[PDB]
Scaffold this active site. Structure first.
Site, mmCIF file in Angstrom:
data_model
loop_
_atom_site.group_PDB
_atom_site.id
_atom_site.type_symbol
_atom_site.label_atom_id
_atom_site.label_comp_id
_atom_site.label_asym_id
_atom_site.label_seq_id
_atom_site.Cartn_x
_atom_site.Cartn_y
_atom_site.Cartn_z
ATOM 1 N N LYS A 9 0.851 -1.210 0.000
ATOM 2 C CA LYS A 9 0.000 0.000 0.000
ATOM 3 C C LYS A 9 0.878 1.248 0.000
ATOM 4 C CE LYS A 9 -4.110 -2.149 1.905
ATOM 5 N NZ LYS A 9 -5.059 -2.191 3.055
ATOM 6 N N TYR A 49 -12.303 -3.234 -4.467
ATOM 7 C CA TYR A 49 -12.994 -3.244 -3.175
ATOM 8 C C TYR A 49 -14.531 -3.211 -3.279
ATOM 9 C CZ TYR A 49 -8.353 -2.590 -0.894
ATOM 10 O OH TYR A 49 -7.035 -2.738 -0.485
ATOM 11 N N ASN A 112 -2.573 -0.423 6.903
ATOM 12 C CA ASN A 112 -2.136 -1.714 7.400
ATOM 13 C C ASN A 112 -1.205 -2.398 6.376
ATOM 14 O OD1 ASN A 112 -4.032 -2.456 5.466
ATOM 15 N ND2 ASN A 112 -5.181 -3.802 6.858
ATOM 16 N N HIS A 115 -1.977 -5.455 0.996
ATOM 17 C CA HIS A 115 -3.166 -6.225 0.727
ATOM 18 C C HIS A 115 -2.743 -7.606 0.261
ATOM 19 C CE1 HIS A 115 -6.851 -7.562 -1.256
ATOM 20 N NE2 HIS A 115 -6.047 -7.972 -2.226
ATOM 21 N N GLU A 126 -8.362 -10.159 -8.903
ATOM 22 C CA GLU A 126 -7.397 -9.090 -8.624
ATOM 23 C C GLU A 126 -6.210 -9.127 -9.595
ATOM 24 O OE1 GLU A 126 -6.563 -9.671 -4.419
ATOM 25 O OE2 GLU A 126 -8.631 -9.111 -3.845
#
Lengths: 147, 147
Positions: A9, A49, A112, A115, A126
């Site tokens: 990320k 998402y 976080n 992914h 994805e």
């Protein structure tokens, strides 16, 4: 073998966590098969998402993923999806085990670090979304020493 | 800022040196701008090593460079070409200083871990050959702490 989509990320790029993150996957025995630096497009994030579209703060979660370059990867090997989820740790880094990526480096649920696909179905979606339909087969160069 | 082309050669991928290699560049302060996993094609390699085409080792070098996936990257920053060359060390790993990529990891000149551009002219030619015409501008996220 099975494959999984792993994306560092934007904030983890800026914290210079690239080598530390790749080490976890490479030392576990998985095979890197694709890699791409991308500035994510709003539309692609909304597709990635789509299962989150009903949730509170969906727009903010998408916005956070638009703040800079991501490193998108495909990692291949036996049980790749479950293996990646275990290396990454719980969504909330406060709940992730020490020794996981989120446990060791992460503080918030929004930043976080990374992914990883949650299942084989989502990994395939994805991969086609971010990388393409023609990811080339890599040599499992040390398969005999790991399986 | 200046760009350089860095490519991890196939044997170094098989030796699982990806994270250790990326670490050198990332901790030095350069910015990753592009990343691609590629199984090199002959015509590409023949262009890239055109200056070596009369050498008796030429066909073997091409075969070795086709024997697996390479990780091709662009790193960006002030003096990135000269900086990458110094991180990497001399062509012959036995001449390279300890602490360099080649000095720490390499034994033979043929399997010398990695390629990095030797000058800005070659970096540009190499990026266009291996990556493409359109690498996006990178955010220099911590520039004020380094440069």
């Amino acid at each position: 073998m099975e494959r999984t989509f792993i994306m560092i990320k934007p904030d983890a790029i800026k914290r210079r966590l690239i080598s530390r993150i790749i080490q976890r996957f490479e030392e576990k025995g998985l095979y890197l098969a694709a890699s791409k630096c991308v500035i994510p497009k709003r539309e692609v994030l909304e597709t990635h998402y789509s299962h989150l579209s009903s949730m509170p703060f969906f727009s903010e979660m998408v916005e956070d993923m638009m703040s800079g370059m991501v490193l998108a990867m495909v990692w291949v090997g036996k049980d790749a999806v479950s293996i990646g989820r275990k290396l990454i740790g719980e969504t909330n880094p406060q709940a992730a085990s020490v020794g996981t990526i989120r446990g060791d480096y992460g503080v918030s649920t929004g930043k976080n670090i990374i992914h990883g696909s949650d299942c084989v179905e989502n990994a395939e979606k994805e991969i086609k979304l971010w990388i393409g339909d023609d990811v080339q087969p890599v040599s499992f160069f040390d398969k005999e020493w790991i399986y």
